[model samples]
Target chain A: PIVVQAAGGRSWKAVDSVMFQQLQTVAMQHGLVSEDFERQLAYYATTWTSKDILEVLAMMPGNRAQKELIQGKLNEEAERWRRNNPPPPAGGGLTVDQIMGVGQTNQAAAQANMDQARQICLQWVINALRAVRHMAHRPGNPMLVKQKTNEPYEDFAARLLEAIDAEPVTQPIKDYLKLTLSYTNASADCQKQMDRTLGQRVQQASVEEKMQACRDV
Target chain B: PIVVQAAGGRSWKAVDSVMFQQLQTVAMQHGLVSEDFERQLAYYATTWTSKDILEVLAMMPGNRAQKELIQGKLNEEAERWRRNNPPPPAGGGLTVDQIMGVGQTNQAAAQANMDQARQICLQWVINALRAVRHMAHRPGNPMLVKQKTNEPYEDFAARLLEAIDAEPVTQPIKDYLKLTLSYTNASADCQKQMDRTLGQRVQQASVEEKMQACRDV
Candidate 1:
C-alpha cells in the first residue's frame, strides 16, 4: 500500500494484524511497549481515528538510523510549527520532575525489574510521542495548532498531543506515554473501572486524617 | 413506626419501601443519605433493617456538629495510629525539608493559593499516613513482611506511605486521600498508583540533569 502523505486517512488495519504483532514484539524487545500504550489507544479513539495509523507508524523508529532520520525530521517540523504557533504558556504542561515521579516510592526500589520486559515501557511511549508530535504539528499540516489561540480545529491537536507526550514526564514515563495517548482504543469499561478504583484508593488514604479533622472540630 | 434492629438477615425489605423512603428522606435532609446508602441498598437488597435506628439516628448529629465530631474522630485515630507505629529507616518518612518541599514549588508560593493547595494536599497526605502508620503495622495486622523474612512490614509501609501520601501530588490525580478514605476502599491501589505517579513526576523534574548525562555518553 502506498504510504499516504501526512496522515491522510491511513487505516491501522492495513498495517495487518501480523505487523501489529511484530511491532509489539519489536517494541517489547526494545523495552518500549507499556500500559501507556493502552492509554494512547483510548485517547486516539476519543479524538482522532484508527485510520490515522498512517501518521503514527511513520514516526515510530525501529533502530538508530530511523532515530536520526526521525529526529531531524521532527526538529524541522517543530520549528516550522513554531513559526505558526508559539510555545504553549509556561506551566500549562507538567514539568519533567512531575512525570518522573510515577512508580517512584521514597522507599527506594529505585528501578523495576525488567527481566521479563522486552523493553522499558515508559521510554517506548516517549519515543512514539516524539514521532507523533512531529507529524501532528508539521507546518502546514491540517492538525497543527495555531500559536495564538492554543485552540483546536481540524488539525489543532498540539495540546492533546502534548498531553499524550507529557513533556515533563521522565524517560521511564516516556516508555509508557503511548498508553495515555491512545487511551481511547481501550475498552471503555476499563477506563471507567480505572476511574472508580482511583476514587476508592484516594478516599481510603484519607480516612484517618478525616476522622482526626472530625475530632478536632 | 419504631426503628428496628437488623436481625437474622441484614436486608432492609423488612420495612415497607414507603417507610424506607420516609426514613431515607429524613436522612437525606440530615445529609446522612447519600450515594453510598443507595449503593449499599442495591448490594444488600436494602437489607439494613435495624432496631438501632434510634441509636444510629441519635449519633447522626446536625451537619455542623457531625462535621466537628468526624474531625475529632479522624484526629484521634490518626494520632493513635502514629503513636503505635514509628517511622523506620529511609529518612523517617520525609524529614522536615522533604516534608516541607511538598506542594511547595517556591518559597513565595508557600501557603499561598497554589502552594496553599500544594501544602494542604501534601501535608494532609503526609499527616494522614503518619497518623495511620501505627494501625498499618499493629501486632494483629499480620503480613507486614514475608513470614520467612525479617522484613518489618510497618517500616516498609511507613516509608512507602511517606512517599505515596504527602508527596507533591497533582489535585486531579486518580486517587487523592480524602476520596480514598471517605468513599472508595482501595487503599492499596491508591498507595501503589500514587507511588508510581510521584516517582515519575520527581524524575521528570530531574530530566535536564539526566539528559545531560545521556548527552555526555
Candidate 2:
C-alpha cells in the first residue's frame, strides 16, 4: 500500500507516486495546471514537512480580523456569483462566446458539464482553503488559529452551487451526471439512450440560440 | 469506474454504448485500453464509482535489465536523492506536478508550506493502493461528469510507468502492468530473490525484449 508523507522532507513509499499523478490529472480536467494548486498544496507541504514554510506564511500575516475577512470574501464572491449567474444574452458585453454560463441549462447537459467542471473546481479551491484555514492543534491536524470557514471545501462548493439562481452551471459535469444516471439504469441498457440524448445531434436541435435562450429561460 | 464486464477477454458487443464510449474516451485513447479491467462487472459510473483495479495488477511481471543492471540504477537514484535532495521529498503527492515536483512546490517553498498545511499533513494526498484516491468518498464531492464537458480523467489514471507507483492515476488499475514497480522497488532482499527466481529482464523487459532474458525476478 502507499501512504502520503507530510510536507517538508518525508520519504514516500514509492506507492505514493501514483496518487500525485492522479490529483494532477483531475486538476487538469478542472482547467487547472500544477501552478494553480501550488498554493493549496504548498501550504500543507511547508507546514507539515518544514516549518520553513510556516515562517514565510507567517511573515505575510493573516488578517487580524478573521470573521470580517471570511465574511467579506464570502460576500464578494456571492455578489459576483449572483451578478454572473445568468450572464447577459448574446450581445456586446454578453454576446461573447463565453464558454461558461450563469446557471444550469435544463436541456443542454453538455454545456452544464463544462459549467459544473468550473463550479466544482472553484469549490475544491474553497473546500481546501477552508480546511487549511482551520487546522487542528496536533501534529498532523496542527491547530486552527483562524478558520476561514467552519465548512470544508466541498461543502462550501455545494452551498455556492445551491445559491446560484440558475441550474448551477452544470456544463462539463453533465456527462458525469448523465452517465451516472444512465448507469443506475444500466440493467436496462439505458446508457445508450443517454448517450444519444446528450450527443451532438441533440445540441443542434435546440431552437434557441446560446445566450438569448438562456435569458429567455 | 462503472465496470463493464465482458465475456472472457473477447466479448465485444455494445453491451452499453454509453459506457463503451466513456471507456474509450477516458482510457482507450491514451493507449491505456485494457480488457482485464473490463472483466470486473459493477456498474457504478457516476464519476466516483466503486472500483478496485489492483487485482490484475499484481500479475504484472518484474524482469528487467537482468538482476545486475537494475541494481546499479536503483543505487544511482538513491544516491542522487541523498546528494542533491535535502531529504526524501518529505511530502507525498499534492498534485501530480507537485509530487513529481512540478507545481507550487516551487513557490516560496517555505512560505507556502507555512500558510498551508495539506503539504505537511501526514497524508497530503491519498495513495492509490491503500484506497480509492479520486472516488470522492468524502462528503460534498459531486459524483457526475456531464456530457460535452472536457475530459477530466487525469486523476483517474494510475501511472503504471512507475509500477512501484499507483495504478489508475486515481481510478483503478486500467488493464494491468507488464511489471509492477512496487515489486521491483520493494526490498533489496526481495529483489535479489525475485532475480534469482524470475530473472530481472524477464519481467521488466518489454514483451519482445525479454523473450529470452526474463527469469524469476
Candidate 3:
C-alpha cells in the first residue's frame, strides 16, 4: 500500500485499487511478479534492484586486511546503533516483521561475554607460570645453575646453605634437600678406609719371648 | 721394629735397631722410592704395583655402555658397603683414612642425592602439566572441532548443556567453555542477518498499516 509520487505532481498514495489490480495481473501473467518479488519491488520503491545491490557489494573491500578495516567500521557502527536504540519500550512496542534493527542481537551479547571470558582464562595461565617459578627458586639458587662459574666452591656451598635456610620451597622439597646433605657426609668415612689400607703396622710377639733367653747375660 | 730372616732355616723375630736402620738406608739409596711409594708397596704386599692396577682398570670393560653397567654394579656394591659399615661405633673411633675403602665416598653420595632431587623435580613438572590439562578441558575434549556433526546439531547442544551440569571444572574454565559455545552461536546470528538482508519487506507506515491501507473500501 506504499504509494509513489510521479513527475506529474500526483502522489501514488491515492492510486485506485482497480488500477493496482490491473497492474498486478499484467505483472503476474508475465512471470515477472510473485508475492515476495512484489513486496521487494514495493520495498525498493522502484529505486534499486537486487542486481544493483550485489554489484555494489562486489565493488567493496576484499582481502583480510582490507576486510578487517571494513569490519572495524562496522563494529563502530554497530556500537553506535546499540547506543542509539535501546530494546523496544517495555511491552514490545515496535515490531517490523519482528525486526528491531537496533541494539545488540543475542549473538553480539554472547560474543562480548566470551571476549571477557577468554581474557580471564589467559590471565590465569600467565599467573600460574609465575607462581611456579617463584616457588621453585631464589635469584641465586644452586638449582638455577648448571655450568661452572668463577665463584669458589666454598662460596657456592655457603650461598646454598643460606638459600636452604631462607628459600620459599615447600616442606617436602626442604626435607629432600636435607636428605641430600646427610648423604654427602661421607668424607670422614672415606678417609678412614684410606688410612686402614695404607697405614704401616709392626708386630713382634715372638721376639719378646726370644728376648727372655738373652736376659740371662 | 719388624724382623725378617730368609733362606737359612732361620725364623728371626728379633732384629737389632742398627741393622734395621742399615737395611732401610740401602733400600732407600738403591731404589727410586718415596715413603708413600714404599708404604703403597707394603700395602700391596708382594702383589700388584700401581702400574698393574691401572692397566687392569683400563682393560676392564671400557666402552660407554659397559662403563655404565660397571657404574651400576659399583653403585650397588657401594650401597652394600654402607649398609655393612655403620659409622664406626660413634665416639670418633674412625679416622678420615678409614672411609677410602667404603662403598659410598663423598662424590658418589653427593651424586646419588642430586639424582633423587632431579627425579622429584621431574615428577613435579609432570603433575603440573596434568593439572593444567585438567583445568583446560574435559578428559578427552578435542579442540579441533568447528562444525556441526551428522549426529545432529541439537545433540551437540544437548551434550554441551549436560556438560554444563556435570562437569567439575572451576568457574573461570567453565566460563571459557561457555565462551566456546557463544562463538558457535554466532553462526545462527550470521544466518539470521543474511535472511534479514535478503528477505523481502513490505513498506509504508507499518507492515500492518500498509496491509490495512491495501484493504479496499
TM-score order of candidates, top first:
2, 1, 3
Q: Give one digit per residue, the lDDT tens place, for model 3 in A1-217.
A: 1222353221213223433333333233311212222222232222212222222222322334433443344344445545665777776432211222224332331232223322332232223223333333432463443212443222233334434434467876754553243123213332233224333311111111111111111
Off by over 4 Å in 1: A1-217, B1-205, B211-217
lDDT score, candidate 1, position B37: 26
lDDT of 1 by residue, B3-76 (tens): 22454221122334443543354344423322222222222221121222222333433355443543454455
Ten-residue region with minimum lDDT total, candidate 2 chain A: A137-146
lDDT of 2: 0.28
lDDT of 2 by residue, A1-217 (tens): 1122454222313213333443334234321212223333332232121122112222332344433443345345445554665664674232112222224332231222233333333443344334333331111211111112332222222222222211233565533432232223222222234235445433332111111121111
Candidate number with greatest DockQ: 2
**Sequence-dependent TM-score of model 1:** 0.17
In candidate 1, position A126 carries an lDDT of 41
Model 1 residue A165 distance off true place after TM-score fit, in angstroms: 18
Highest lDDT against the true fold, candidate: 1
Tens digits of per-residue lDDT, candidate 3, B46-123, equal 222222222222222112212222233334444554576577676633222222222333233223223332233223
Model 1, span A1-217: residue lDDT tens:
1222364432212222233334434443442223344345334322222222322333232322233234444344434534654444863332222222234332221222211111222333345545533332312222222223322121223333444453445755643433332223223333343334444432232223322232233
DockQ, Cα level, model 2: 0.02
